[PDB]
Amino acid sequence: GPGSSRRKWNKTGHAVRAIGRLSSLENVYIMADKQKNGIKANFKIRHNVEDGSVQLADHYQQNTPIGDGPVLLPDNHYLSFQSVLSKDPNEKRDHMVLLEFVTAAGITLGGTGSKGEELFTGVVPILVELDGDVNGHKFSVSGEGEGDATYGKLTLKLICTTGKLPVPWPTLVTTLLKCFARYPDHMKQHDFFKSAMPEGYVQERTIFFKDDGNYKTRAEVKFEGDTLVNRIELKGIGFKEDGNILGHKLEYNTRDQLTEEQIAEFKEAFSLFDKDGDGTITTKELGTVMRSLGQNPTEAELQDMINEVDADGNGTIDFPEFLTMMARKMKDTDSEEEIREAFRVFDKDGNGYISAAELRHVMTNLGEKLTDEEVDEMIREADIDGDGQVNYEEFVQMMTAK
Ligand SMILES: [Ca+2]
Ligand SMILES: [Ca+2]
Ligand SMILES: [Ca+2]
Ligand SMILES: [Ca+2]
């Protein structure tokens, strides 16, 4: 057809790109399996390959309740995942520290929920145990951590007890606790996972690695004492002894990635908004901090603000949502300006220096509490050139664990 033969090349390779852009489903969709009194999920994971490529893992997931209870069968919706992989420098073994932030979304909105859901209310210790055989290569993984459903948080430390792990850690991530997802109140009756809980659910998967082998897994996620347990049997077949997986061509982490430390800071900051520590930030709660700083956003101005970062459009922001809005990277001239603007909030009289009382007003309006000696000591920490107060330079080189 008509158009520049340049126009046509590009238009063809915009729609091919487009297809791959639409095909990259980041979310994890949940459907019901009422006949199986359960749920399923079919999703893909893109594992970065060392040489720029990508190894994708086609996941096919089935879930069922172990017990005979009532269970909540959910409508179509999705989980939303943010994973952070790291190492403990103390730990000497082949291992992984894994942090997940899982939030539920997908639905536009007495009360109820599940009994089984009152068990996630606070922090739950986690035990994970995995038994696999990949292409004959046998290994065991073990680990502990905790789950904090309110901030959709999961933290684990996973050891390979049998010594060297014969597959890359990334590939085991999905396998080694969706009951730690934050289901927003407005859909807390689509949380199959907690509902099935105390007796628990089976989570079976087949993961197809493109041009490489497959993993089969069957796991029981149930309570033992008050430890939430994830116990797995993993069987892998079809894998070339030198594909990305068995040859370890897969990479651990990206590199622009949030440290465990940073995420902790973002949690503490989230708490500053979440006055009632109920895991969400409301228009009310946002207003309170805003006014406290000295602004007057209207009910509507707040609702907008939130609705612009509130994935599940329920009017509140939960920690993964917050964590997401903080995890966006910017054109570092926007980031720079963000810092310039943060500075001007701290530097209240706008004289270009943050004083001790200026630092105190900000932390105080933020709902922190502070001894004069802590204030004076913070200023000590930032006051490089030692003039008793903090300029823009000092603020920048003090603000950078972004
Ligand atoms: Ca709250
Ligand atoms: Ca929300
Ligand atoms: Ca000042
Ligand atoms: Ca200074």
Author numbering: 1 to 109, 122 to 188, 192 to 417
Publication excerpt:
Crystallization condition B (see Experimental Section) was used to generate a Ca2+-saturated crystal of another high-contrast Ca2+ sensor variant, Case12. The 3D-structure of Case12 at high Ca2+ concentration (Case12 structure B) was refined to a 2.6 Å resolution and revealed that the binding mode of the M13-peptide to the CaM-domain was similar to the recently reported Ca2+-saturated dimeric crystal structures of GCaMP2. Case12 structure B is a dimer in the asymmetric unit where the M13-peptide is bound to the CaM-moiety of the neighboring molecule. In contrast to the Case16 structure A, both lobes of CaM are bound to M13-peptide of a neighboring sensor molecule. As was expected for the Ca2+-saturated form of the sensor, all four Ca2+-binding pockets of CaM are occupied by Ca2+ ions. In contrast, at high concentration (16 mg/mL) in presence of 1 mM Ca2+ a second distinct molecular mass of about 90 kDa was observed indicating dimerization for both sensors. Therefore the detected fluorescent response of the sensor within the whole range of the monitored Ca2+ concentrations is induced by its monomeric form rather than its homodimer. The obtained Case12 structure B most probably resembles the non-functional homodimer and should not be interpreted as an example of the active Ca2+-saturated state of the sensor. Similar data were reported earlier for GCaMP2 Ca2+-saturated dimeric form. As shown in our light-scattering experiments, the formation of such a homodimer is favored at high sensor protein concentrations that could potentially be achieved locally in living cells with high sensor expression levels.
